[PDB]
Design a protein around this nucleic acid. Structure first.
Lengths: 153, 135, 173, 99
RNA sequence: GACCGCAGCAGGACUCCGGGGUCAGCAGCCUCUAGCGCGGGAGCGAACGCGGCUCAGGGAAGUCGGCAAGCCGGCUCCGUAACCUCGGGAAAAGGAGUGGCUCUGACGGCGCCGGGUCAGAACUGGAACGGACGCGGGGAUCCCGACUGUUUACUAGAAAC
RNA sequence: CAUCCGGUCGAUCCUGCCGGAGCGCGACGCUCUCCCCAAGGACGAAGCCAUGCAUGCCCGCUCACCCGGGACGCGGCGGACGGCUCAGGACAACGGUUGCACCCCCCGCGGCGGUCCCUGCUAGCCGGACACCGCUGGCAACCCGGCGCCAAGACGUGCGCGCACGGGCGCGCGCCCCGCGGGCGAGCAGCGUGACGCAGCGACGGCCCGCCCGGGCUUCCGGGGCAUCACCCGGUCGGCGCGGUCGCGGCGCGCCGAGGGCCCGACGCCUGGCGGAGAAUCAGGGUUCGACUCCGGAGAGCGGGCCUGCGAGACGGCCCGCAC
């Protein structure tokens, strides 16, 4: 709001940034749309200057489909994490299995920061970007180093 | 005969040892001049070709393999050096160029690329019909 | 058409997929509109503010930013609105080149005239920063409507610490 | 398609003109011949105009018909010469009880 | 500036000290200092030389042979083969910019001071920039010698030594 | 639906492969008194096409040296259906599973059917303006020359209920979680307010919303070989804005941060690579092929662009480049 490094101001589009000017009292400062499937939102995600249009809890995004889960290996991309799911495929010729894996990308928001080795659900959503179609909701960090073990959860 | 008609002499600009461009769709990229037909040479005179003078040319390595290693009759359509037609207009073509023609005058390929000079058209008719523009 | 297809883009892993077919009309792309804003008609009368309706899939009609200079603004605080012709495009923010040709862009900060909004001074000190802008006839606002797709010049007025963030740039930078 | 230039050249095969104001001396076999116009006005708007009643506006009389006794195309095999019914180009453009 | 070449001979003779400016430079091109106007002068601008300059179009077709001219070049930045004694080739080859102005950043000492080097931008020049000067043409092979070196001072600088 | 046997030797017992033996599909050859049902230019030629046909149907508006049979055109709708071939295409096409609260759609079908008017108004019906034709033009054809009248269930101007009503705006719920109803699984729609504004149709008033429908993306799980292809991509990969599209999107266009994906084989290369439903032969377990019915995808010599439309980059639409 007073910072001048960003070339442009970022605001919640649903609330007019002009709606509130002085003696703010009876207006709603943050637009929050409750997510589907009743996954709980931590009060940490409800309070803050985070807009993140991609985030479903705040910003114009809603989950419309399946809620897969995988583990976080990469968080370097800006506000984006690459989660790896593992699929065990039954081959008929030999009833033994193959641990093929897939790395899928989503949108995390600073409201729920992630550690390495966490269980992160991704919600089927509007096609966000070229590779982005999913969005993170629930994060469960595991202690020490979780490695892999090809665990589908 | 094949070249038919009378041409008032126009200034001649391309001597032997000249790689004129080739605009035909026959695919000969470039033609190197060897001689100009009907040249009575004076001592130490390189034979020279004007717009519309049948010349024998050899296609270079760039050109298609079949036409290479052979003398092929061609008619120069464009000459860079300015030439004065009897109208007194002085006209210069942007780049030296030639079209491969039969002794009859049938071109190796149908298309003629870019401008064709009016003197080439009178002497050689097939070029005139296929000319995109006769400047 | 100038298509917008996934196949044309490289795969995430860097594969260059050969397109399965040729380009498609429902994936067609159109001419980006360069909007024209008139600082003054003055002596010349050749250019006037004209809008374009275009053919679309399903017969839908699209108004376009052919030539739009007249502009409308509703004071968020008052909820009342006034319509005139805006001065020009001031902060495209994507590119400063766009500003020179006055190419309008959705929600691009512009220079706003106060030909019918000078009435604000009559109310006592409403938005004193806006009052200082209104009398001058030069204000800041973002035309928040889609010009190319819907040909709309209606826009919001800039109020809030957001206006101050933009103002800090708008004043010397 | 190749289109001939508007300014004339030396050809003899094709050309065509109009007389904006032929003055006197209209030729007996050419310009003078004043010929009636066939397909005489067939609409009520044309009835209130060239047909003969310009100031009527919406017409109270409604129907104005200059009978056309002309037979229609091919007859001599039938030899019904006696029935050249006097039809009119159909009258129209009126708000009848139906409208 | 007088030595030695028959001589007051565009020749040969050893060092000392060596300002500024453009520039990488004890270079080239100008210049203070310091010297000084040479076996004379005037016409006339023919042939023909001698020392340059340029040429429409094509270009080695000229010739014993690209002889000679010409092309290239400075700087920065990418891009740099085959081969190979892996050290080279290699500046391979092949491109892009360069001017003047208006400026912004990096570095030694604020209490004032260092030094111009580099980047990064705008704005403008008939569509011009190493604008004079200094300053590689390039590639494909083959034959001899490995090469750095030495040679018949006054006809052979090599494959010879 | 669970099988053999001729062959290494002087013999034997083996491993091991050669060969028969069974069975399907096409050639080929030898051949046919039958009768019935029947595939049929798929096979390194998605090579070239001569010759005909392959999307046509009704005149509201007929005034045509006719008749009750109506030419013609303007219009109306269909030729985006089908038929054909799999060339191209290897996280694509393709089978099934998600969603579209990121979305368009003609036919039909069930609702709605107020539409201010500034202006002109005839608002119980206003225009002028084209074909057909009439008359006379060219060329070797193609190709369509002028003029003259003339009508629309043709095309256009415009009346009509400022809770006009076109979009699109600008702007207005919340109060730490969750339930309520027009609501959903999901605070989504709608309404109100303020500014515009000119969509209706309308000269025989049909716009609108649904339902279906056919698309358009999209989520997962699948979806050839090759490592004598190991590191690859550089809009590449995440954001941040914006344009553009029916539409989400790197899709584009700016702006940034350095990302992406990989031995579980990335990227690359090749394919006489359309995938599936299927087909073949077999105990199980397999193996092999999928071009031909059908289903989806493509493509009409080859590349591009564009029109018309509600939908095609259509190709018995167009226009250009390239061949012929």
């Amino acid at each position: 709001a007073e910072n001048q490094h960003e070339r442009a101001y970022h605001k919640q589009s649903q609330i007019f940034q002009g709606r509130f000017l002085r003696k703010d009292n009876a207006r709603c400062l943050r637009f929050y749309k409750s997510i589907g499937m009743g996954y709980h939102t931590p009060i940490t995600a409800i309070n803050g200057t985070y807009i993140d249009k991609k985030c479903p809890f705040t910003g114009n995004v809603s989950i419309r489909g399946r809620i897969l889960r995988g583990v976080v290996h990469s968080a370097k991309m800006q506000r984006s994490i690459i989660v790896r799911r593992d699929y065990l495929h039954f081959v008929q010729k030999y009833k033994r299995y193959e641990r093929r894996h897939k790395h899928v990308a989503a949108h995390l928001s600073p409201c729920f920061r992630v550690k390495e080795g966490d269980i992160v659900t991704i919600g089927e959503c509007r096609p966000l970007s070229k590779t982005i179609r999913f969005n993170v909701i629930k994060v469960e960090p595991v202690s020490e180093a979780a490695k892999k073990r090809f665990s589908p959860f | 005969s094949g070249g038919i008609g009378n041409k008032f002499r126009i200034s001649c600009g391309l001597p032997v040892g000249a790689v004129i461009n080739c605009a035909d769709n026959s695919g000969a990229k470039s033609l190197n001049m060897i001689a100009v037909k009907n040249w009575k040479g004076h001592l130490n005179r390189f034979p020279k070709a004007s717009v519309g003078d049948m010349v024998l040319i050899t296609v270079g390595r760039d050109g298609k393999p079949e036409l290479r290693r052979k003398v092929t009759p061609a008619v120069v359509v464009r000459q860079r050096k300015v030439w004065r037609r009897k109208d007194g207009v002085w006209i210069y073509f942007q780049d030296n160029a030639g079209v491969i023609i039969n002794p009859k005058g049938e071109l190796k390929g149908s298309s003629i690329t870019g401008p064709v000079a009016k003197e080439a058209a009178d002497r050689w008719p097939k070029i005139s019909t296929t000319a995109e523009c006769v400047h | 058409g100038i298509t917008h297809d996934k196949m044309y883009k490289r795969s995430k892993t860097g594969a260059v997929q050969g397109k399965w077919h040729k380009k498609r009309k429902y994936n067609l792309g159109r001419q980006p509109a360069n909007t024209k804003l008139i600082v003054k008609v003055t002596s010349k009368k050749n250019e006037g503010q004209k809008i374009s309706t275009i053919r679309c899939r399903g017969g839908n009609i699209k108004r376009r930013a052919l030539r739009l200079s007249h502009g409308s603004f509703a004071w968020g605080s008052a909820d009342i609105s006034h319509k005139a012709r805006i001065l020009q495009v001031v902060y495209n923010s994507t590119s400063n080149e766009l500003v020179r040709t006055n190419t309008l862009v959705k929600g691009c900060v512009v220079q706003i005239d106060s030909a019918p909004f000078k009435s604000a001074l009559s109310n006592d000190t409403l938005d004193k920063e806006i009052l200082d802008q209104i009398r001058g006839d030069h204000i800041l606002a973002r035309i928040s409507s889609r010009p190319g797709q819907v040909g709309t010049a209606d826009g919001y007025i800039l109020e809030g610490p957001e206006l101050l963030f933009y103002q800090k740039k708008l004043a010397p930078k | 398609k190749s289109i001939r230039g508007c300014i004339v050249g030396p050809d003899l095969h094709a050309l065509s003109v109009v007389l904006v104001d032929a003055g006197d001396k209209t030729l007996p076999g050419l310009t003078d011949v004043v010929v009636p116009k066939r397909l005489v006005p067939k609409r009520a708007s044309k009835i209130r105009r060239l047909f003969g009643l310009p100031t009527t506006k919406v017409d109270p009389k409604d129907q104005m018909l200059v009978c056309e006794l002309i037979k229609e195309l091919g007859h001599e095999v039938t030899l019904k010469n006696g029935e050249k019914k006097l039809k009119y180009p159909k009258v129209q453009r009126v708000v009848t009880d139906e409208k």
